[model samples]
Target: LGGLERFCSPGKGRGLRALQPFQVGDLLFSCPAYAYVLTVNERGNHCEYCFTRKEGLSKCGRCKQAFYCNVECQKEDWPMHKLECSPMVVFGENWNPSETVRLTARILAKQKIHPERTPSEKLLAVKEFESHLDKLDNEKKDLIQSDIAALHHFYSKHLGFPDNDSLVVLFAQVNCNGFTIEDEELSHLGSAIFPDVALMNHSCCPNVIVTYKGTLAEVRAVQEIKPGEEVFTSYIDLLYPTEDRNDRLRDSYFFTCECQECTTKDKDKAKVEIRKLSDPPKAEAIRDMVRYARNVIEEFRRAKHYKSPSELLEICELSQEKMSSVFEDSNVYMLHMMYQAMGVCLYMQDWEGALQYGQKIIKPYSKHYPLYSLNVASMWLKLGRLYMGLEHKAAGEKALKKAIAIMEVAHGKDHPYISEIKQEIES
Candidate 1:
């Protein structure tokens, strides 16, 4: 967030304040990861260095794991991967560590090597990030202990840092500040920490959109921002109504957002629409419905843990079937379940199945989500990729066009990803 000043915000604490006018689509800044770890499931598919999926990847000789798109990337990742490489081989299939533990270990290692903040951290140092441990909800705090337990076991021989000093504070900071790096298609590839990016506070309605290109965090002004205005970005999905959104916010970040979107809840009705049934809502039913849908979404996220594609798809259909009766196709909850179903279908390479669900949500996603939303743009990008995968050239081209239209604003016209999309369209 260059050219921006960091100052104490009255209620929000530290936030980046722009010194000059920023037009919509302006690239606010890019924050490189201080430490990042690619997901285990992505190993064979994505290069460890760039996290890009490609053919003919090179694998690490020492570990026989850690695939890279090129030898250069393999070398690049060594500084980060070396600490765990032997451990990875020693444990083999047992080398499994949750993404949280892996990310923190890498961060802890980097902290040792540098012993100070990287240049990127000058604006907002890693140590400066609040732990919020004092206010953390019990379950969330207890989970931090689980991470510590596993971290100790995984790196006992490799990095036996003491219990309380750097280890405890770092874990707490990482608990809230760590980022999930998603590809342009919104696919989760890795988890990382970016201190500079962490300075931007949360808003239910955000003015800037953060998207990733490889491991770089790209912040773009989705709405025109004037001088001295603070940059606001969302920490969670905005599809849920106010109660649900804040519930998640409080659960994770340990703060209740008073952003107008949360205070006013201007869009709640559309999100949890019960209009067809005179919007009676049974109000209690809305509570149960959202809770149940949330649990289902969580299950979908963890589907790879222990389920076949067919089994997961049935689970998705069951929820979708139940949701359809209460909320129409346009309802946010229904759209969410549909999105999950589409992803499961895509995981199975059921392109036709994915395409059907994709087509259904495009309208509702566009209508409900804010303009220049990366979520909407990524949905288009995924649909375009799906159509192209199916050799449906016409639909593919149109889908890519829609994606470009929004991405140009959310990712900026000159973003490298736009070029990739254009290349696909041309070929």
Candidate 2:
């Protein structure tokens, strides 16, 4: 999926690089889950195998530990389930395993069944993922050690193999390799480990973004990637300023980023910093509204996907009203909330509502973000579609032309969206 090579470097260890030039929106690679676990909270709400949300799922007859959307999902999950179902039947009732424990157990189960042949290069590949186990505080280590012991006992009882030394390593492996699976609105759904994707290292200004389509990870370039360039994905949110990003990477991934953006910002660094961006003290209400609305949107997403368009519209409308009242129309938070509202309205197919939000967001988004960035290009595209829906032919064509120009720079003329936009203009 990406170039993986080894050489001596200062901050970055072995990292993945690009073999060929790639435009934005180009699929770099896609990998299926090796093993994944739904959050304890999302068990019944989402399918255990595919991670799709649906009503009236059937529970596994033997273990009763997992729910599935239908027979196909259950059949697909059986190879892994057969190993886990028996264990669950014996240990599930008496011992409730944490997601991490279950994930580790699943890995072990795969190893046990496919002991003869290497299934996707086996545990050795995952062993290379950086856990920074030594860097974790004693308290965290103790907790991990407890998990290791529990897993050890469970395996010892069921599988009867006596080696326990690698359990801790596997526990650390899961910590470092797991990727969060989320819905379109970025609600947390589950976590999985993809051996190949884990090879890519972190940068604040990343070339690629990993998005989930159910249990499969669709890796795409967010910016142009030239041949021999190191492929990077942000381990922390890119919106976070340098200090916060550094702290998070240091605490979790255990490395200070020397990416281009961080190096530039760190040159004449602030003596002290608290927040990622400066906002007036009075803008707290605006911040609160964005946070609350996003949470509600996520809840509705999980509750019933597209069934609550009316509720989604109301929450988004309230957020827009509160944000406009509390903050300047062009404030970043205001622009963000408006853009989110635009997305919700788009999802609901509320053309008029989408047009209003799109019109509101475009000016501020264009002013605040670079013209050649995804944020601006994507908003332009949305505005074009909204205008087309509103029967503003000239305006729609102009907005789409602007979008095509930006996307040609940001992604490439050959990118799929650029072609799609061109087709839209022709139609």
Candidate 3:
């Protein structure tokens, strides 16, 4: 974070807010990644080979490794010898979050195999990793202590989940980055390879991007940076507003964000207040429309008795129009709800409406939640099944394949999710 406490004030966790403007590709900090917890939840987050973002691609089969657009890209990664393969197997069917974090860090920072190092040497590496975590936490604590009690309490309160104590609990240990609470149920899945790097705080617009080369991890600058600038990486979904980011981070990470965005609530308060004052009537109207739409979609989904494409089309068009008025364009929750409803309409051979809204629901969700996330995987699985009903074999196959890739990371190849996707592919 660029000797942040020394450069910026202690309470400002804004990761060196570009004191001066930066050019596009300037070098920012490039620290090694710390231990991360691997959960089936994070699978297909990026192309394992090149760290290319995977919006809608299928991943490799064997290790259920990274996703690739073509075999040529997969082939280019053969030199890595499927580095994540052994680790995936070692994680077993279900691993805890803490162990996943530890194992992920070990692999990223540790030796490849024990044939060369003695047991004693491996012990030393473990000790070193533990020590590094301690130092980081100490530094984090020092930064927190820099703020006044009133200001600090405000951050801990309105900034987000002040009730979520896990924020500070995670910092109790050195170098430990907290696991994503939404996927905490997946803790035992596998650990991430980096731990220390996880300590980097969130930002609305991040400056750093994490990449990997086989087992080796790299942090490259996504944007430019000045020499003294502190680097930041996003923790919560960045598109979310300050409230959502704070709530998620507080509930998930158990800490109040002192980041500039969180602290800058005053900047947007008046504007938000204005919107709040004006939006009640529209909100009420939207609420009534949503209820009607939900009823329409529910009948179609529950009955399974649509006569033809036209009936489905009429229902979906109305539903989508109602939902559009109700939700902000970027609401991921609304997107998924719409996706589930449209997927049902398409199931009864409804092509027109199914394809139209399905595309909308799936696209942004893929960007917001990682592919391995349960929500993303389920959508893909549903999409595969829906495509089949529409008799679009190619699209159906693509959806099933994507579902399999996501489930493989969230729930291994033989898991039930994979089996469901397999059936879709077969259909």
The C-alpha lDDT values of all candidates are 0.84, 0.67, 0.47
> Model 2 clash pairs?
none
Give the C-alpha miss distance for residue 40 in model 2, angstroms: 2.4
Query: How do the candidates rank by lDDT, highest first?
Result: 1, 2, 3
Candidate 3: residue 171 Cα off by (Å): 11
lDDT score of residue 296 within candidate 1: 78
Give the per-residue lDDT digits (tens) of candidate 3, residues 1-427: 3322223325442223445544433333333323332334445664434444358656677666456656776785443324344444455454223333333323323333332543322112222322222334555556433322222332222122222233233333333343332221121233343443543556655666443322233344555666556667666544344665676665545556776656775433221221223445365674465455446545656544644555555655555565555455445435534565565555565566666666666666676543235556556666666678779899889987876775554343454445645766776
What's model 1's lDDT at 216?
Answer: 79
Best by TM-score: 1
lDDT by residue (tens digit), candidate 1, 1-427 = 5578899888878888899888988888988888898888788788988887788788898887789988889988888888789998888888777888999888878877887769669699987888887886677667877788888878877675766555667788997798998878887888999899999999877889988777778898887889988889999987777887788887878889999888887888787776567556577887788778778777778875798878877887898888776777888878887887788898787889999999998988887788888788899998998899889999999999999999898877887889999999998
Displacement of residue 378 (Cα, Å) in model 2 is 13
lDDT minimum window of 10 residues, candidate 3? 179-188
Q: Is candidate 1 or candidate 2 better by TM-score?
A: 1
Is 2 or 3 the stronger prediction by TM-score?
Answer: 2
Candidate 2, which segments miss by more than 4 Å at Cα?
Answer: 1-10, 82-95, 116-124, 153-164, 266-427
